């Protein structure tokens, strides 16, 4: 792992848009309770997959 | 990789195996012969959804 560097523009990069997307979903997932229709996984159930 | 694709050498369990070909050497386990095989795929009817 410590030697498996990737070129910029690869999805596997920790600084890639996928990494940014993971951080956004990780923190914004619980901004609402599951009871609310405003919950992220309720309004858009496809995002989790 | 345009000729040989990906070599089967024990990647992670999903990882796919086509770029867009798969190949590896396989010593046939009924005898002592060592074969090299190659499979190529042409995506068909809505593979991308």
């Amino acid at each position: 792992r410590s030697s498996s560097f990737v070129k910029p523009g690869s999805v596997a990069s920790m600084f890639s848009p996928a990494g940014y997307l993971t951080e956004l979903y990780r923190e914004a997932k619980d901004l609402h309770f599951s009871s609310s229709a405003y919950h992220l996984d309720n309004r858009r159930p496809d995002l989790a997959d | 990789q345009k000729y040989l694709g990906m070599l089967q050498n024990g990647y992670s369990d999903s990882t796919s195996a086509y770029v867009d070909n798969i190949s590896t050497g396989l010593v046939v386990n009924n005898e002592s012969k060592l074969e090299a095989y190659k499979i190529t795929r042409v995506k068909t009817d809505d593979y991308d959804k």
Partner: protein
């Protein structure tokens, strides 16, 4: 080591821990059958033994 009849190797990184790694000494290279020494890396996933 001449006084104790040892061969000591040193390495910096490995490219994959799921690959079997031995140590080959060969006067020719390119040819696995021309070797004069071969040792399995004792625990694998190891350098400097």
């Amino acid at each position: 080591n001449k006084t104790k009849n040892y061969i000591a190797s040193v390495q910096g990184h490995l490219m994959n821990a799921d690959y079997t790694r031995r140590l080959i000494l060969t006067p020719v290279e390119n040819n696995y059958y021309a070797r004069l020494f071969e040792f399995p890396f004792s625990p694998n996933t190891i350098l400097n033994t």
